[PDB]
Design an enzyme around this catalytic site. Structure first.
Site, PDB file in Angstrom:
ATOM      1  N   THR D  13       0.703  -1.155  -0.030  1.00  0.00           N
ATOM      2  CA  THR D  13       0.062   0.029   0.135  1.00  0.00           C
ATOM      3  C   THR D  13       0.835   1.057   0.022  1.00  0.00           C
ATOM      4  OG1 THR D  13      -1.840  -0.975   0.824  1.00  0.00           O
ATOM      5  CG2 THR D  13      -1.495   1.302   1.456  1.00  0.00           C
ATOM      6  N   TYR D  27      -7.956   0.828  -3.004  1.00  0.00           N
ATOM      7  CA  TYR D  27      -6.736   1.083  -3.647  1.00  0.00           C
ATOM      8  C   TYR D  27      -6.200  -0.255  -4.410  1.00  0.00           C
ATOM      9  CZ  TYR D  27      -4.979  -0.318   0.597  1.00  0.00           C
ATOM     10  OH  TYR D  27      -4.702  -1.200   1.649  1.00  0.00           O
ATOM     11  N   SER D  60       1.375  -7.938  -0.492  1.00  0.00           N
ATOM     12  CA  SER D  60       2.117  -8.741   0.300  1.00  0.00           C
ATOM     13  C   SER D  60       1.279 -10.201   0.726  1.00  0.00           C
ATOM     14  CB  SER D  60       2.456  -8.151   1.754  1.00  0.00           C
ATOM     15  OG  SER D  60       1.451  -7.754   2.593  1.00  0.00           O
ATOM     16  N   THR D  93       1.667  -4.423   4.429  1.00  0.00           N
ATOM     17  CA  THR D  93       1.547  -4.654   5.640  1.00  0.00           C
ATOM     18  C   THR D  93       1.224  -6.207   6.109  1.00  0.00           C
ATOM     19  OG1 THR D  93      -0.546  -3.911   5.836  1.00  0.00           O
ATOM     20  CG2 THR D  93       1.332  -2.213   6.389  1.00  0.00           C
ATOM     21  N   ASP D  94       0.574  -6.833   5.283  1.00  0.00           N
ATOM     22  CA  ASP D  94      -0.140  -7.783   5.743  1.00  0.00           C
ATOM     23  C   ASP D  94       0.662  -8.959   5.948  1.00  0.00           C
ATOM     24  OD1 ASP D  94      -2.520  -6.472   5.254  1.00  0.00           O
ATOM     25  OD2 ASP D  94      -3.356  -7.445   3.512  1.00  0.00           O
ATOM     26  N   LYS D 166       1.229  -7.628  13.018  1.00  0.00           N
ATOM     27  CA  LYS D 166       0.021  -6.675  12.735  1.00  0.00           C
ATOM     28  C   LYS D 166      -0.866  -7.142  13.758  1.00  0.00           C
ATOM     29  CE  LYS D 166      -2.590  -5.094   9.004  1.00  0.00           C
ATOM     30  NZ  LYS D 166      -2.642  -4.713   7.443  1.00  0.00           N
ATOM     31  N   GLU D 287       2.390 -34.865  27.498  1.00  0.00           N
ATOM     32  CA  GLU D 287       1.118 -35.432  27.452  1.00  0.00           C
ATOM     33  C   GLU D 287       0.507 -35.340  26.288  1.00  0.00           C
ATOM     34  OE1 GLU D 287      -1.530 -35.551  30.435  1.00  0.00           O
ATOM     35  OE2 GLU D 287      -0.347 -36.405  31.983  1.00  0.00           O
TER      36      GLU D 287
END
Ligand SMILES: N[C@@H](CCC(=O)O)C(=O)O
Ligand SMILES: N[C@@H](CCC(=O)O)C(=O)O
Ligand SMILES: N[C@@H](CCC(=O)O)C(=O)O
Ligand SMILES: N[C@@H](CCC(=O)O)C(=O)O
Lengths: 308, 311, 311, 325
Positions: D13, D27, D60, D93-94, D166, D287
């Site tokens: 972005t 966008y 991304s 960012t993702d 994030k 366990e």
């Protein structure tokens, strides 16, 4: 064998140090513990002269070959002031861990017992050395320089919102996350083992209509420093500016901190005084008091606020 | 068509130097959200905002909201004391029409200045019919905070306005308002506080609690005629032996003492073993505002204590 | 007189194995706050709680709250999926009487176990007249969270249950409840969802979003007859080309796709250029619960999207 | 003189634009070139001698391990040069936390590597990209930033690639490390360093991928009520080498998840139990099946498991990596 840990009691609701130890006998499986009653007071009554004596005693204990670490029980309300004082003045890499409790020892689900166990585990771990003074409650290991009491009344009150924890204790295991990028303990320039008294430093709040006469009153009682718990980033009203300029004319060192709770007060040449970096008002007062035992040079004090 | 919104400017870096009209023309997109009128109320840095001026701000907002051609008001303000001004108006504005304070952490000339989007969001909030009846709001950084809960938590960051324990009333994401909470407190049209006829406010100072805190500061406050003292106490308003002596002297002279907390969050509970009233979850700055307004109506400590539990 | 509170036990380490009466007697102070009756509904670790059992839990709570001799219900439960069970009842319980889920992060035998005080606080909340009409609540660590906002945010800490953007409905400090917020969402008596006549729920699975996320997991869910897929997406429900292909295949077969977020907080906004509906601020686990209940009433994506904006 | 900084652009972005300035969504990511970004922020040239290099231009969410591998290799080439003092990587960012942690483990240099991103498109009102980029360049060019691991810079904060995530779908302040804090902050054109991470990274990391062309396949499965056994079957049948479990609470497993993990392990699949909660420690529990993720969240745990599988199959070694990296 087990590490040798002294539990040094100062008071606080977590509490008789031997009563505390026997109430949590599991500590004896983590360390060889010896209890010492240093004081027995509520931490709102802890004073700089007593904290000085606390640091001197801790330095003596840690100089001994048969002491691997120290746990200090303390009230929650000012543990961050006592802990930061020792953070700057303990001349050893051996762990010093303050511990406290938000619920009284008789309360249902009292937090003191498990906080103490965790503090002893931290103080006894070889990997805990060289990390500065620590504050342990609620499974978290906080640095004395960053940790603060953020809530009046909750178990999880000790937080460092922007700086996080040094580590956590989960499932009887320590997880170290951070080392603080500041000077402390053995790297610290401060040595107070020959001191008997400390400089007077007061804290004044910033708010709409804040009054000039509180600066006058502080000056007239001979303070050596004033820490300003400022609006926003240490912003000052016209009344606060008048008060600070009067204080500086009499040789008082002014540090502008913040009332907000977090973050950086940046340098600003158009405003009076030095800036507190990310130190909150309570921690800034501790550092300024110790700085004033060595210097009045504003450049040195300002660097100290950026490096300690 | 569009809501009618007055942008009432008091100063602050969101402008303060620039005038309100410079701000509006720098963000022409606001005119697609509302019919906006700029009114320059003052132009000061918020650290110099004073109770006498906030009193006039509340009176002016009350006049504006009484008009049929005003649907809401956006108040531009500096960040440092916006929480004090907003809570004052939270308690004294006698309308359900939205009153939204807005501010910016970066100056309008900065790269990536937050002021433009903060203003756009404030106008969208003030002009939305679903915003009515919610109390006074503070809008920055896509968040809608209640004046009673929101505080500046960080000296210098864009996300500084938070209510850690109470959260946000709503958020603004993708040009859409998402309301999450209604505050369970009295405000605006259900508040007993009315200052439309007042000219001055009682003097209330704030004293900090810390190791070695001095009795003389209480002496100084008494000698200068404070009517109330807000104590930003250690932990849950805990008091040293010196603070106890100072508070006992203040109360003997008729000063009302409110024990708050320096910690930043949480409840100061009643405690018979300590002097003074308790601030509930009000921080020292908000407690000073409420105590000043309480003292315009009563000197009964039991009434003042009930105000602190309900407002 | 004291309120009549049923403590309905489902399992979890707050009784960890242990019967409900043993837990009540471990906190005898609850009997001073209410007339309590224990009922053992189930005894399982919450990671094994299933929709068919939660359905029966909801039906039993509705039966209890229909009685005049029941003022509220406390449900003991494991922490790991309490937010799923609590949100299910939040949407399906047809009463304003308090329903308070309670749990413990430390086992009942641990040093400084949190269960006793959590249970005492839950009973205080369930029995207080001011607690009515607030939706289903989750009470741990002195906090009262709404089932719609509260989530387990930390794998292992006592303070794990938080709602970062929405805060708590209230807190319990010094044996007193302080209410802060009312949620601005539909729930309980104003919810359209009713499962009192159902015996099973539509199948809904959750797929994670991440770099290299595989298309074949969508294929597998389709082959096994899911009616809905909740996507724990990257960022604001962003989808790779492989996830888009998988979602388009699922929607062609009549599967309803909800885009949520793996991030933990915040709004997934509408985006018509991406497949599926959006989860608003519901996290994946809550989004699955709402989608299951939505599919008992409709398969219309427009209607389901409106549900995600209002519940 | 000024430090020499390469701005290596991958998309996102921060290079996104839109038809108007009022849309913060709708966008298109990865549509502006790196030189468009630099010229929009000419002040960067007073902080560093900058050279833009277009590595990729994608959203991304479409970043893949094969491309991240090439990114790590390209950054290692750049930092080996005497005329490169640091690298800034623009990214969506993702999934920046996945790419950043991969390079955190594989970059063989103490020179700063700083990922930067934006939550608002470059055309938005009050877009955050311009100042984020300037802060990233200031960080990358400061000699005090060396030896700190890979960093992620947005919103005046410097986060370690190992802790930062994030945390919010849509806000400017989304990147947080709730329990570990920030390495530092940037306020008033000045860097304030607070922490050094107490984990292995970069020059003290054993992970080296500079000669590799492919990576082991690792999938992530969610934990929740009624979670199905068939997703484990499907992962096994499509040849995963590892499974990261985004578990309920502290990696707790239903009876169906246990059956699935045992089937996976019988086929030699390595299982890491992580948590869906967002924060905190998954502790050892013998366990239960599988290894535990320590404080690594599912996306970070997947990266570490993929890299671990490039050098070891030993479960004791892999578990130790999760406690030390
Ligand atoms: N004011 C008391 C509170 C109890 C405690 O924290 O131990 C103290 O700080 O000592
Ligand atoms: N001290 C200034 C800071 C700038 C701002 O916040 O607008 C004020 O509060 O006005
Ligand atoms: N897995 C257990 C954890 C212990 C508890 O929270 O009760 C459960 O959720 O039941
Ligand atoms: N889905 C987009 C959003 C980018 C961003 O928010 O930076 C990406 O990650 O590329």
């Amino acid at each position: 064998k087990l590490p040798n840990i002294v539990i040094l009691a100062t008071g606080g609701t977590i509490a008789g140090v031997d009563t505390l130890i026997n109430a949590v006998p599991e500590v004896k499986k983590l360390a060889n513990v010896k209890g010492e009653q240093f004081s027995n007071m509520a931490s709102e009554n802890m004073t700089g002269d007593v904290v000085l004596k606390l640091s001197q005693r801790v330095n003596e204990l840690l100089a001994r070959d048969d002491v691997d670490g120290v746990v200090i029980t303390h009230g929650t309300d000012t543990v961050e002031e006592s802990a930061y004082f020792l953070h700057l003045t303990v001349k050893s890499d051996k762990p010093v861990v303050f511990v406290a409790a938000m619920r009284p020892a008789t309360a249902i689900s009292a937090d003191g017992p498990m906080n103490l166990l965790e503090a002893v585990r931290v103080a006894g771990d070889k990997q805990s050395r060289g990390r500065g003074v620590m504050v342990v409650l609620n499974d978290r290991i906080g640095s004395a320089r960053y940790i603060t009491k953020t809530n009046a009344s909750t178990l999880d009150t000790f937080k460092a919102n922007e700086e996080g924890y040094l580590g956590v204790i989960i499932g009887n295991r320590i997880y170290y996350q951070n080392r603080i990028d500041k000077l402390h303990t053995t790297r610290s320039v401060f040595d107070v083992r020959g001191l008997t008294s400390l400089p007077k430093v007061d804290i004044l709040y910033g708010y709409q209509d804040d009054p000039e006469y509180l600066y006058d009153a502080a000056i007239q009682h001979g303070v050596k420093g004033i820490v300003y718990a400022g609006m926003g980033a240490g912003s000052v009203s016209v009344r606060g500016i008048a008060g600070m300029r009067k204080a500086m004319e009499k040789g008082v060192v002014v540090i502008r901190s913040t009332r907000t709770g977090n973050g950086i007060v940046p340098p600003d040449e158009e405003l009076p005084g030095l800036v507190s970096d990310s130190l909150n008002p309570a921690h800034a007062r501790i550092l300024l008091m110790l700085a004033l035992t060595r210097t009045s040079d504003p450049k040195v004090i300002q660097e100290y606020f950026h490096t300690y």
